Design a protein around this ligand. Structure first.
Ligand SMILES: Nc1ccn([C@H]2CC[C@@H](COP(=O)(O)OP(=O)(O)OP(=O)(O)O)O2)c(=O)n1
Ligand SMILES: [Mg+2]
Ligand code: NA
Ligand code: NA
Ligand code: NA
Ligand code: NA
Ligand code: NA
Length: 326
DNA sequence: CCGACGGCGCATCAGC
DNA sequence: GCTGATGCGC
DNA sequence: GTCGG
């Protein structure tokens, strides 16, 4: 990409701040800067030029000037040489192992893949599955496979009850040619913001997907959110497809628009949009958009009849999903 | 200068 | 068991 | 780390 060296540097700094420093606002600041730089249509010549962008300040501009002049950043070169930072950064690549658990494992002498592989009994369920599919989870999913996965999910959901509607969201809905995982929004007329008329709505769908061997493992599961693993079936003599992460979120049917806005993302787009809503006097979650003034107490849910209605409330021109990849 | 940083689901734990 | 905090996740 | 109040 046009300013790939710069965005890569900022992303690595963001990851260091989240995983090692345990400084979430620096992690978010670096990612916000990387995002705005990624969409800038010019090859950046200086930190001063980048500083004109919202989210890029004095310190990142200084880093951009060093990176452009030398092709490196001394701060990262030192971080890369730090054993504790390297160990923590590695451990956090396992799903379920965050900054806290990574540092605790390092303290206990568990810091390599081999260490993890002989210490499964020291991992929780999620971490154990994250270790089992360490390599598969770092592989991307081509859109062709995402289409095959979409077919299986939509068809199996239909077999359970023709009234369910499953919508693939995330990067897929934004039109990405490759995705990190599969995000599925699910609705059923029996579950609305007013009542839940049938129990096990998410459970029956998870069960059916497990029955046809599509869903292979479970990381966490509740009444409205499933987080697990799935795998496309392979043909005779064919090498198996990698196991993939899949998230399914059952949202009240009458709140589909706020739900699909949320699940489509991106994550940075949502943070940016929700922050703009706050400045405009509103608060947005996956269920509703409500006013929120100076008193600091949220009001009643406003009528939403399209994703566009949410953008209108906050005085933003509508952006198609493909234009939300921040 | 300095307060705030999007919003919430599930797993795991400690206090009562 | 219930509740609220924390960790990790979307 | 960056921003607006
Ligand atoms: N911090 C987060 C993470 C996720 N999401 C929402 C928007 C994206 C959606 C699914 O999350 P991911 O699967 O992580 O995002 P993605 O855009 O689908 O990217 P990827 O292709 O890597 O799956 O959930 C969010 O609002 N806040
Ligand atoms: Mg995704
Ligand atoms: Na700026
Ligand atoms: Na992790
Ligand atoms: Na083994
Ligand atoms: Na082993
Ligand atoms: Na996901």
């Amino acid at each position: 990409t046009l300013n790939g060296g710069i965005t890569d540097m900022l992303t690595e700094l963001a990851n260091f701040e989240k995983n090692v420093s345990q400084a979430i606002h620096k992690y978010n600041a670096y990612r916000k800067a990387a995002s705005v730089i990624a969409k800038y249509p010019h090859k950046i010549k200086s930190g001063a030029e980048a500083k004109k962008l919202p989210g890029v300040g004095t310190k990142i501009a200084e880093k951009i000037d060093e990176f452009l002049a030398t092709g490196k950043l001394r701060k990262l070169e030192k971080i890369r040489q730090d054993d504790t930072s390297s160990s923590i950064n590695f451990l956090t690549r396992v799903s379920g192992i965050g900054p806290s658990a990574a540092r605790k494992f390092v303290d206990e002498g568990i810091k390599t893949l081999e260490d993890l592989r002989k210490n499964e009994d020291k991992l929780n369920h999620h971490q154990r599955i994250g270790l089992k599919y360490f390599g598969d989870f770092e592989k991307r999913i081509p859109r062709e496979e995402m289409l095959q996965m979409q077919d299986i999910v939509l068809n199996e959901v239909k077999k359970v009850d023709s009234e369910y509607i499953a919508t693939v969201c995330g990067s897929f809905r934004r039109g990405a040619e490759s995705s990190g995982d599969m995000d599925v929004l699910l609705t059923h007329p029996s579950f609305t913001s007013e009542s839940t008329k049938q129990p096990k709505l998410l459970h029956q769908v998870v069960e059916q997907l497990q029955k046809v061997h599509f869903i292979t493992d479970t990381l966490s599961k509740g009444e409205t959110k499933f987080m697990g693993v799935c795998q496309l079936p392979s043909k005779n003599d064919e090498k198996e497809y990698p196991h993939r992460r899949i998230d399914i979120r059952l949202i009240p049917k009458d709140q589909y628009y706020c739900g699909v806005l949320y699940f489509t993302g991106s994550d940075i787009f949502n943070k940016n949009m929700r922050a703009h809503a706050l400045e405009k006097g509103f608060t947005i979650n996956e269920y509703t958009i409500r006013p929120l003034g100076v008193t600091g107490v949220a009001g009643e849910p406003l009528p939403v009849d399209s994703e566009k209605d949410i953008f209108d409330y906050i005085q933003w021109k509508y952006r198609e999903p493909k234009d939300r990849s921040e």
